[PDB]
Amino acid sequence: MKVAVLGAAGGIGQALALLLKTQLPSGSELSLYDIAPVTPGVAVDLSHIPTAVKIKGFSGEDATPALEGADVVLISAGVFNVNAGIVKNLVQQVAKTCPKACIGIITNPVNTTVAIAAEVLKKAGVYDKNKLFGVTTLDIIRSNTFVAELKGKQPGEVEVPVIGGHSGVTILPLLSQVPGVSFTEQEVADLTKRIQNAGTEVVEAKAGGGSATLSMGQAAARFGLSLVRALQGEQGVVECAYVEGDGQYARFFSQPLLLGKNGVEERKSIGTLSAFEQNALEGMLDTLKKDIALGEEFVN
Amino acid sequence: MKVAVLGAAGGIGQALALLLKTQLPSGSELSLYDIAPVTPGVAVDLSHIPTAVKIKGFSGEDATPALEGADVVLISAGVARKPGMDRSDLFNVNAGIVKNLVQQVAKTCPKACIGIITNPVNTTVAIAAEVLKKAGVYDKNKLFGVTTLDIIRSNTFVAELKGKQPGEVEVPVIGGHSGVTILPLLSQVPGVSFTEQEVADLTKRIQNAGTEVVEAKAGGGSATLSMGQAAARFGLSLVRALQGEQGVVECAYVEGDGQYARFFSQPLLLGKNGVEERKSIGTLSAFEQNALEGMLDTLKKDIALGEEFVN
Ligand SMILES: [Ag+]
Ligand SMILES: [Ag+]
Ligand SMILES: [Ag+]
């Protein structure tokens, strides 16, 4: 299995590529692409790590040699209209070289960039709405972290389902669906506030010198490794991700997803919410509906 | 168990802190320091990862709060890599930085184990040792030069040449951490054999493996992610030994019995107070014998250069 990382020279890409090189199953392939000329040396750097994952790096404007034979393409490129244009460019190169690969969108805003990728794939005739994901894992592992410390549990065993979007009030952690724990509304309100503002938390703490990179690479790695496991035949792999579903909420919506050999195999029900969980649900569906149309207007 | 990472805002430091945050034992402590103002957010970034490892980051020129109660100090500050000058551009840049931080270590966490990542390691460890002595707290069993990058590189290249699984190959590397001071004991890799051509070519590559990365990074970057991995392996092995695990062996640059030089890399049995026992380098090939004696007085000039700087 071959994984391509677009934008691998950035903070997120290098962290993601380091975890993939050390955690992808033996025999896997890892290709790194980024416009930055340093990218072929990022792969040589990683290639000195003694794991059974071959890795090669590519630079320049053409991403084709890195996408040839790619089964999964993770895109953390860019640094709104410059990032939207870069997303559109790279999805074009993917549709030309690896049209049936699974595509995980990391470049933000996810709510809008996934819509851009969808329209680019449709205009190419190679669109599979089961193979395009918006990577929202960071909200989940953030929720897991915050919940575990408040309630004194093992952080690695907490799993909070997060649904909706990847921006602000569109991020909805389903804290009522976490087993063995209850929360006061004072805790439901505060946790939902921090999870939807945790991105700002790292922005302020970095002295205006960057966004979340290492935790995002960790979250992107979790999603990529789950995807590879399910693509390789493992059963019962479920991750919450931002996909094009039934339209019951928006054209693009993040919910728990059963992953399979062809990307998504079942978009799981969101369960049954608390009262506040559907107040925050319906109370943002146009804020998510507007983010999607912004992505479809950009292409045409 | 509290681990302090000095220089945590750099490429090596950020990759190191990322691996430590996920692989350190549950209940461990991680403190990040770097003069760069981004360092507190580097820890807040890592703090959002659901592992039982608490983390906080500090900036300014005072590393005291990060070193407070530290059991291990990993220093990858300054310009910890890579090929500049013959190696003396880095010395003049990093010598004062290593001296500053090791000084702060000796007056806040003098009992902590110290791992020096900042290069030139052959010389920066001598700076650290002498600085700890004049502070009156020098423990020869608690000061290491991190040479693990040479080992995992040799594991990679040997597993590649001999068609073996990369995680199953372990190559002992002795001597120093630069050029001809890097001696991989290919004659001790269990279950494989090499030719003279392979020994000389593999050694040559391992001794200059940093140039593979520099010229590939378009001349504008060093080995950062592989170094963070190598430093993580060394730190995790040290922490395991510090928590009571027995049989933890890692090759690293320490002050030994001076059979070859005052400081020398060799297999080290690690214990609850740092170095438990300095193991013998075993029987050497004729090639490894020639390589050893042919590199000692340049290793000694490396050590002498660092001693002169502190007095
Ligand atoms: Ag796929
Ligand atoms: Ag110690
Ligand atoms: Ag060893």
Curated annotation (Swiss-Prot), chain A:
It catalyses: (S)-malate + NAD(+) = oxaloacetate + NADH + H(+). The keyword Signal does not apply. GO terms for cellular component: cytoplasm; cytosol; extrinsic component of membrane; membrane. Changing residue 279 to S: In strain: E2666-74, ECOR 27, ECOR 45, RL012A, RT104 and RT174. It is an enzyme of class 1 (oxidoreductase). InterPro entries: L-lactate/malate_DH (IPR001557), Lactate/malate_DH_C (IPR022383), Lactate/malate_DH_N (IPR001236), Lactate_DH/Glyco_Ohase_4_C (IPR015955), Malate_DH_AS (IPR001252), Malate_DH_type1 (IPR010097), Malate_DH_type1_bac (IPR023958), NAD(P)-bd_dom_sf (IPR036291). NCBIfam families: MDH_euk_gproteo. HAMAP family: Malate_dehydrog_1. Catalyzes the reversible oxidation of malate to oxaloacetate. Homodimer. This is Malate dehydrogenase. It comes from Escherichia coli (strain K12). The gene is mdh.
